[PDB]
Ligand binder design. Structure first.
Ligand SMILES: *[C@@H]1O[C@H](CO[C@@H]2O[C@@H](C)[C@@H](O)[C@@H](O)[C@@H]2O)[C@@H](O[C@@H]2O[C@H](CO)[C@@H](O[C@@H]3O[C@H](CO)[C@@H](O)[C@H](O)[C@@H]3O)[C@H](O)[C@H]2NC(C)=O)[C@H](O)[C@H]1NC(C)=O
Ligand code: A1IJX
Ligand code: A1IJX
Ligand SMILES: *[C@@H]1O[C@H](CO)[C@@H](O[C@@H]2O[C@H](CO)[C@@H](O)[C@H](O)[C@H]2NC(C)=O)[C@H](O)[C@H]1NC(C)=O
Ligand SMILES: *[C@@H]1O[C@H](CO[C@@H]2O[C@@H](C)[C@@H](O)[C@@H](O)[C@@H]2O)[C@@H](O)[C@H](O)[C@H]1NC(C)=O
Ligand code: NAG
Ligand code: NAG
Ligand code: CL
Ligand code: CL
Ligand code: ZN
Ligand code: ZN
Lengths: 602, 604
């Protein structure tokens, strides 16, 4: 389109001021038509929807090509030297073309692999048919039968991973070609550029080192409990934990096995799932309850377009959907939606808050020039709803919303709560860190196709201390059985969030005027904490996240002390328990795999 | 420190520096000698009393290094980098690096004790059940047994006996070493070891080299795996998995020359492993070293001096004494004493080792007149390549014929494949191992591999690069890296990777200088005084000039380059790829998790 193709403009700071306004003008329309078509497909997976999606992806590249080439022409000389930092941010972004740098037939091919990988992931079933969500999800969460958990884990990893591998290798090659033309050594380097930090990798590594003792202690304590349940045949007290026994397909959060490891067991059940079902909660209640938390802070309610247009339950009409929960900004300032195959569980209630966190962000920055309508970094975007969920999950808040009868504020209830929170937050950390370590090595060429599974399991064992419960080889592509890999969504943002949410939480609880233990704070109804959060959300990516962070929390860097201080009591406790059972921290028997159950699979 | 050994005063300028280096050189050689001598006494006669003496000599060295080091600092800390004299900058640059001399005395004593105990553990470890030593007993088993159970016994016995007791010492050594070098301004000890190559893209340069060589290795591996499967069967060899690490002829699987007889593609052609002929003919250690020497003199390089023949240890002592058997060359730094210590056995590969060690001696003879600080190879890989280049000529069929080791001469395509395959078992099979060892140790020095992952990371790398797997389960009580000499002995490894590449660049250049005009793999530089003069210019330089410029003068290129090695191997590279295809092989080891079962009723 002519009216989409760029204007003239002079080569100078002024000219560039007009240029950017012209850019963000036509981009609104283009982003709209992409986001719109992926939506049609994600909630209705067909050949046709795929075709449409590809058409839109092409139009985007054409736009990006035209506008990036123009910004090179005009500004490539002089843009790093404009006094205005907000402009410098916008122009640098504009001149990064991405898959737009590809010639046309490769542009095609890349758009198509995304579509087949997405389809394979979200339509894969396990047969003797069970889908990932809800069937395999519920099995992994609540079955305590070694053999059934095994059959779900293997069936899933085989059904999703095997067929994806050939496509993923093609995808990597195209993505790398594309980004090399913007001056990036490879795609991973581009993804990392989003944090604008020279010492990014080193910083993450220093963070992980302070967090590792917490995970090691939690792991040994949980390993001990799984040994009690499953015996020496299947659990090695000095070896990795079999990857299917931790309550989740990816072993990435362990809250579903809380009932097996709860430290003082007879006390009130801090998992309120059975009460939610007892009371008849539905998807709609969960969303309204999340919203009211938002509005209690004087943040924005969800608009009519959100309720009218979102998909809050898996459709009952035999229609393939991408189940994985997600939040959608259509770049209209009007349409914002969530697509979630919502189940009635306490962990889904948290997911609903996580997703609505994204929507709130999008409502707070909708009056920005498109290119500023991102989080200050991707980690910020992932942390917003998680922050509110930390207040929601407190026993006192649960009591306020009628899901729990008031607990006694004693040291045992503290420990039980902190341990549940550790199963969700600390257990996640190694997996949050390792996923993009795998994918950065793939994009760099350090991990060729001939080592995709070898390097995956190296990292899984290294960081999470888990092992595959059945033999794997390079026909298997176990990384491809996690959503974000075929769906090309970066992962390091979740490790950043998991640390960042504790920094935000402590800053918020301070603005709230709260004065007790960090892990007992509820910011519900604090207009002041709301005010501070609002300033973060409206800023989008106009400013450096380092400065956004300082204004918010008083420090200019990611920091583990808030998280450490939140969990201090359970950290101290777990250390004591492991000693008394004389545990080995870590998994020195690193070659150990469990045997197969007798005559598997029958 | 003895008064005559201590630094005086020198002005704070380049003219003071020169007098300083000259005064240092006078005292350094006495201090180097006492230290080398004490190491010799210990290594040829391992006793508590000898280790005590070596420890005291190492402390004296440290006192010397610290006094001359801190003086070199005090007077020249900035200005040394701006010296007009390049050799003087290199000398000062070395003197000002203190290493272990940076530790306070208590820690220096701890470090020196650790080195001594780690050396003693490795060089006195035995496998029991009447005791087998590594050399010759376990070496011979790995080389000639074809009994899966026997090889396993030797492999496991060794790794358990040497590795397990070393692990606590290695951990403490790593920490002290890093603490020492970090006061020289290095992030860790591996950064200091890498600085010897004076190349900011060193790690990337090596990775790029490795990428070009990897296909040759994968094809050699697959072909050998097939040969082992036909002998050991489907239970112990997985045609799509890593090879068990005790079946390749060598304790470390680091070179595969010993399974030549099982892989030779054309058995009707002359037998190129002449070990049996050396035995039939009655060769001893002394003949081996004299034949090596005569190659050097044929090139008009120097003979071994009388002090070499009078002082060297050329067989394992019969008199009942513990010795360090691993072969080594020794410069005493007095310009007079130069020695080899080798438990020589009468085999073709030992004849190659004789040449390797004599190449070291020849370098020390040619540079003996330089300042002590420049008595080193242009980089460490240069010192490792000298003897190997000559051994390339020696191993040729035509050369073996001239020295009475191979009666039949043939020049046809099948004999050439046999020869190039035998050379690939020696040279191409080593590459992955030569590359991986310091990747392991650089990770340990940088803290990426903590003690809790020493064996996990070691086997990750052994599988990744070599495509082998341990034949019994290992865990973190094992310390398999410690079962290789250079780990406990603290000798860096990347130099052998460098030298396996560089020796083909040197070979190509000396062949050309020799006037030789046929296939590169049939060249013998024997009796070429032109080739000798070109080599002599390298040897005479020591570390006085940047290795990149020495290389360029020699070979006409200023970088390591895989092209000469590819050219040498081209006929067998192509043959192995065609054979593996016809046989339907899988290149690589996609069943990465596979390990062989135990023999029924092992080890009874
Ligand atoms: C073993 O045999 C090879 C092959 O020899 C050649 O091909 C055979 C099939 C027969 O036809 C032989 O008669 C024929 O020579 C020998 O390699 C060859 O060596 C010759 C002699 O040095 C090489 O010729 C030289 O080539 C250069 C140019 O590169 C000229 O400047 C010279 O004047 C001269 O002609 C010939 O290139 C070379 N062939 C190959 C494939 O490199 C080989 O020397 C012989 N080896 C032994 C140990 O005897
Ligand atoms: C269910 C949660 N879902 C993701 C998500 O919401 O992050 C979804 C799918 C991938 C991206 N996403 C979005 O919604 C994007 N709109 C967010 C980025 C943006 O808006 O700019 C999740 O994956 N999670 C939750 C935490 C752990 C992680 C996981 O489940 O692996
Ligand atoms: C047997 C050969 N042995 C070494 C050797 O000679 O390199 C000996 C022991 C370690 C260092 N060394 C020396 O003699 C040094 N004095 C030489 C360096 C110098 O003087 O500047 C070796 O290990 N090798 C040979 C190639 C493969 C390697 C190995 O066997 O693992
Ligand atoms: C639960 O008990 C703890 C006592 O251990 C309370 O913590 C104290 O709370 C007061 C009031 O805010 C503060 O002044 C103290 O500094 C707190 N002490 C410590 C050591 O943390 C906590 O507030 C109680 N709250 C609930 C939820 O009942
Ligand atoms: C890879 O694995 C596939 C699945 O088979 C299972 O794993 C093998 C390794 C056995 O140990 C057993 O657990 C199962 O049969 C195999 O079909 C396939 O052949 C393996 N090899 C390759 C190269 O893909
Ligand atoms: C070995 O060393 C001891 C002292 O530790 C010495 O008395 C003995 O003579 C030495 N043996 C030989 C043969 O050098
Ligand atoms: C490692 O293996 C050995 C024997 O194979 C065994 O004794 C030991 O218990 C295992 N070590 C550890 C730390 O578990
Ligand atoms: Cl990210
Ligand atoms: Cl080296
Ligand atoms: Zn999210
Ligand atoms: Zn050597």
């Amino acid at each position: 389109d002519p009216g989409l193709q760029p204007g003239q403009f002079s080569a100078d700071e002024a000219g560039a001021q007009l240029f950017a306004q012209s850019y963000q003008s036509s981009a609104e329309q283009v982003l709209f038509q992409s986001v719109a078509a992926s939506w049609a497909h994600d909630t209705n997976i067909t050949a046709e929807n795929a075709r449409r999606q590809e058409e839109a992806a092409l139009l985007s590249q054409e736009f990006a090509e035209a506008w990036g080439q123009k910004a090179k022409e005009l500004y490539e000389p002089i843009w790093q030297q404009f006094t205005d930092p907000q402009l410098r941010r916008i122009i640098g972004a504009v001149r990064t073309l991405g898959s737009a740098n590809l010639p046309l037939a490769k542009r095609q091919q890349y758009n198509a692999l995304l579509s087949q990988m997405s389809r394979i992931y979200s339509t894969a079933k396990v047969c003797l048919c069970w889908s990932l969500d809800p069937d395999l999800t519920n099995i992994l969460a609540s079955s305590r039968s070694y053999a059934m958990l095994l059959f779900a884990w293997e069936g899933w990893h085989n059904a999703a991973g095997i067929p994806l591998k050939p496509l993923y290798e093609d995808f990597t090659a195209l993505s790398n070609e594309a980004y090399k033309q913007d001056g990036f050594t490879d795609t991973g380097a581009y993804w990392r550029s989003w944090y604008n930090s020279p010492t990014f990798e080193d910083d993450l590594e220093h963070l992980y080192q302070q967090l590792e003792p917490l995970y090691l202690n939690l792991h040994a304590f949980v390993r001990r409990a799984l040994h009690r349940r499953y015996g020496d045949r299947y659990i090695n007290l000095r070896g990795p934990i079999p990857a299917h026994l931790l309550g989740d397909m990816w072993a990435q959060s362990w809250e579903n096995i809380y009932d097996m490891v709860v430290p003082f067991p007879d006390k009130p059940n801090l998992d309120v799932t059975s009460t939610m079902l007892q009371q008849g909660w539905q998807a709609t209640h969960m969303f309204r309850v999340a919203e009211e938390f938002f509005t209690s802070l004087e943040l924005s309610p969800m608009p009519p377009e959100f309720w009218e247009g979102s998909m809050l339950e898996k459709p009952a009409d035999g229609r393939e959907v991408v189940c994985h929960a997600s939040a959608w900004d259509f770049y209209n300032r009007k349409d914002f939606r969530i697509k979630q195959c919502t189940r009635v569980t306490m962990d889904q209630l948290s997911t609903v808050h996580h997703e609505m966190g994204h929507i709130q962000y999008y409502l707070q920055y909708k009056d920005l020039p498109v290119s500023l309508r991102r989080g200050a970094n991707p980690g910020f975007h992932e942390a917003i709803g998680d922050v509110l969920a930390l207040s929601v999950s407190t026993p006192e808040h649960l009591h306020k919303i009628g899901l729990l009868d008031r607990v006694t504020n004693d040291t045992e209830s503290d420990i039980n709560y902190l341990l549940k929170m550790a199963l969700e937050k600390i257990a996640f950390l190694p997996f949050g860190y390792l996923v993009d370590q795998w994918r950065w090595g793939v994009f760099s060429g350090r991990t060729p196709p001939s080592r995709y599974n070898f390097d995956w399991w190296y990292l899984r064992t290294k960081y999470q201390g888990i092992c595959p419960p059945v033999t794997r080889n390079e026909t298997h592509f176990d990384a491809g059985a996690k959503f974000h890999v075929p769906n090309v969504t970066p992962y390091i943002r979740y490790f950043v969030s998991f640390v960042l949410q504790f920094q935000f939480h402590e800053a918020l609880c301070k603005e709230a005027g709260y004065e007790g233990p960090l892990h007992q704070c509820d910011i519900y109804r604090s207009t002041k904490a709301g005010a501070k959060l609002r300033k973060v959300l409206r800023a989008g990516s106009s400013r450096p996240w380092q400065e956004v962070l300082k204004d918010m929390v008083g420090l200019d860097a990611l920091d583990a002390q808030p998280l450490l201080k939140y969990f201090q009591l359970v950290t101290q406790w777990l250390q004591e328990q492991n000693q008394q059972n004389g545990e080995v921290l870590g998994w020195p028997e690193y070659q150990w795999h469990p045997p197969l159950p007798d005559n598997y699979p029958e």
